[model samples]
Target chain A: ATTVNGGTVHFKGEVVNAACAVDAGSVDQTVQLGQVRTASLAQEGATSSAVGFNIQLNDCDTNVASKAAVAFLGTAIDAGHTNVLALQSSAAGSATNVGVQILDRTGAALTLDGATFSSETTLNNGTNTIPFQARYFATGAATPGAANADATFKVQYQ
Target chain B: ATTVNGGTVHFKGEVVNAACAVDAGSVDQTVQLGQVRTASLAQEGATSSAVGFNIQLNDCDTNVASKAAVAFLGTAIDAGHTNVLALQSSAAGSATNVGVQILDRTGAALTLDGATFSSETTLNNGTNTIPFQARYFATGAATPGAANADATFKVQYQ
Candidate 1:
């Protein structure tokens, strides 16, 4: 291109501070599984029964803030499956053996420790409902096609 | 010298992208870890601080997209100083015991829980520099004065 080099090391401090103005229309919202039945995922750590997801935040205000957290990066759901969220093999079909599981609404398995999908909690100001669940599991023994994956959540206020 | 004087050339486009284009003289490139001491502290944490910073790449083109992975976000230096890199200390000669530790190239800290840096490596598109390091521990009882910290990285292309 023409002279491209990023700079903004002003990642400087203050956590008695806060930030919460997120409502990108359900955050790039999309949680549809209009079809799930490769024999309905027979067994072996099966999933994909219905649908559910949440990442809504708005009007948050807490001047002289106390504490808050919310971290869940992406790309990690392999090597014996690290608790799901790694299915970027969708050619609009046969989503590379399936993989896209991010859950933390009392369904367990929200591990994306390859970048973050756990730890960093307490971001209270106005509205916060981080309830998550995106099934389509069975990283093994589920040869159904058409699956996809993506995760990018960032909002840290301390 | 118009175009509004060194700004607004905006019309950025991203159509064909497989990314590996870095090496504009290593970009904004600055590696200085000068005068840092507290009796040369290293209580189980010290390569004694360093600087060989690089994430260089050049003319990379991926068709089927072979492989690439690199993660390094921002915000840390609290919550038990998660790998440290939170400084501004009101920035006037800056230094308050310690807070500026980063690693990679087999050292591995580069923490950053504000967003990135959890050490996700495996990159080789144009096969350029991608070294990493920046050390300094003893965040407690190690007041030596004028120790600085700065971090801003947004490079992720899988």
Candidate 2:
């Protein structure tokens, strides 16, 4: 045989036993809401004005869960707005209805449905921030251009 | 749609500007060339002896090469025995005409070809071992039950 199968070796990963320590700038964190206007998101539950984001959770040790929450994964502008977040580009001018909402310090909206978490904190052995809030939610008559939307959180322990 | 492409993320890697640090039990290493019989691999270029195996390089710094070599990859039972090393099972009783040789410390052999290395070393800023040897090479009348032969090395820094 001439040995023609060349390559392939993929070993993905995931081994979490965490109660904290996820703050290397909160691992690839970036949040900037700013600028909004399509007439302030034409109704359909308009929103566009939130901002503040945090995740910072250094060294914390509740010995493995004495409460802690924050889920927020992605792709969910459908199952009836599971905390909306689904606008990764529609190409043309991208941005038809608008989505991306993740709120939680009482400002409501925060589900993303995956494992359902958010609102529960009591893990203080060292550091912890966890607060959150993003904006731009309209999902219907909000035609603008580039209303970006991306999410990925997870810190649920307890 | 339903997003039914749920798997497959093979991102193999190799971005080594390496001048050292490959010691963690030498990255998944295992070298056990022992127990050989068929009347000591009867004839046809018989060998069956050599053993010692090492790789241990750690934090060396030649700033990127003041020599270093290893490269022992695998499969090469033909191509006029490019340093031979092919014998991962052959079914019925497994071994037939054996293979797997890799020596160098003047014991010669060493050259599984793919990039060819094994004989060069002078980058001592911290630690280094690189020594090697294996055995069981008959390539003809030998027929045992399991004469395994697997390799995977790669250092080459100058």
Candidate 3:
């Protein structure tokens, strides 16, 4: 039995189903926490002011994942500190026994496990936004010392 | 010692890597071989005209691998003909007993087990090209049938 393509063996594909891209400016979202004096923390387990920032997704391949988790990482001043991120090892005039804590949209400690700050809200075919917060948390004496912290993030789709 | 943040804590992010993109004309690359009559094969174990195509990569992130594997998957005309590609639906009238086999540059039968084909090649930071060939083979009685096949490729990095 001789055969012809019964129908066109359709060859089709798209540059779709790719991980959504991150906006350029959104990536550089920074937080500036001014001078943390000895009284700023008041005492151990105390903290200073918090500032908000956002992570925006753009040009998403909506076909990818509807949700994404943004994992946070970097140095942690306190080995036991989970939500508190650490300052860069090279940060100048940095304080000791203190680190940065990220807050969620409702102002809760943003846990960082396995370098994952938070399971983020990703999308299937469009844009998304992740709100975040940063503040200083004292793990030790609020002695006269510099307070600096940093944290990085990674997005995982679920 | 009082600590002071040098200044802002930059929250940097970006979508760094993914599967490399297939080039324009290269992805549309055709493995077109001239048509052959089913009567041409006197018996079993006959091979037909072979043609080649190139798969090119472009616009890849440096973070992605410079090397990748081309995996093949689809219907196999015969369970024993591991390297054979099956005709798509609606093309049942196509030539029977004949199947396609991809070949390597060495002109030897590139055996496909499960879902892999030859070969893995390295590329620089930018563009790369991988050449491959395909041909029809007669494994059983050469009964006249359609000569159409389709397969998809997956690019995996090391």
Candidate 4:
């Protein structure tokens, strides 16, 4: 018989604003589960300098079996920059933009899977397709706008 | 002609684990609106005491209609005793031995509302009644079992 204790998972990607002009960027990112639990956010970056932002975990618990509900609170100072945050997942993405991405310990890119996003027109499931707003340099400027964007994500163990 | 000056609103409340052999006590809570919007909790009682909870508001948002939401979460420490936590709205109740309370905020006591929970349930559109939960205790003093009960809530303001 064999026994396993614990392992690691990582999700690394850059967000770019494709707009030709500079605009302020805002995101309310979150991960949800059926049961209540708490997850943490880690590393970040950006194309422009002075990338100011904040992240918060609101209303979390660890004992429920469902999606790991997540909420993102903060504004990115630089528009076309990459701000990375690490999250813990107890389940896989059931909907879109809500899945576990295998990453390295430092949160570097591995095999990207199970992630989705809700856009203005359509909702994209975990097809490994990054949204236009998430692509590098999409907004063109360091600051985007006051409007907020969000995506729900999750991870599961087999 | 009338001009509205920008101002700030402050709301506060307290989180409590009510434990009473009889009826729960009273909880006085508040929520604020305006330029600076927030919520607060104010609890008055002894440790391991149960009581009824109440919420109040002042200078609410006049421009838009507002509703408050409350929730509860809990983890049981001892048998026959539940621990409750509020996740979304302002509510109060007793834990039946081992339980946990996650989030609880208060909104307009009457209105149509939708809530999120681990288990599937019906959503009420017109009424003051909100969602709640009761958890069970696990065996052992140091070792805890799975999270038996968890919930999340939201208050919509139009």
Candidate DockQ values, in order, are 0.01, 0.01, 0.01, 0.01
List where candidate 3 sits over 4 angstroms from the true fold.
A1-158, B1-16, B26-30, B60-63, B89-92, B106-114
Tens-place lDDT digits, model 2, residues A18-58: 86767778777778786788898887788888887777777
Better of 1 and 4 by TM-score: 1
Residue pairs with backbone overlap in model 2: none
lDDT of 1 by residue, B74-97 (tens): 556677767777666464666555
Fraction of native Cα contacts reproduced by each candidate? 0.00, 0.00, 0.00, 0.00
lDDT-best of 1 and 2: 2
TM-score, first chain, each model: 0.32, 0.38, 0.72, 0.20
User: What lDDT score is found at residue B121 in candidate 4?
Assistant: 23
Docking class of predicted structure 3: incorrect
Candidate 3 lDDT by residue in tens digits, B71-110: 5543455456656664432301446567777775556665
Global Cα lDDT for candidate 2? 0.77
Give the DockQ of candidate 1: 0.01
lDDT of 4 by residue, A19-57 (tens): 111111212333222221111111122211111122221
Q: In model 4, which runs have C-alpha deviations exceeding 4 angstroms?
A: A1-105, A109-139, B1-9, B13-143, B146-158
TM-scores of the candidates in the order shown: 0.29, 0.27, 0.42, 0.21
Sort the candidates on lDDT, descending order. 2, 3, 1, 4
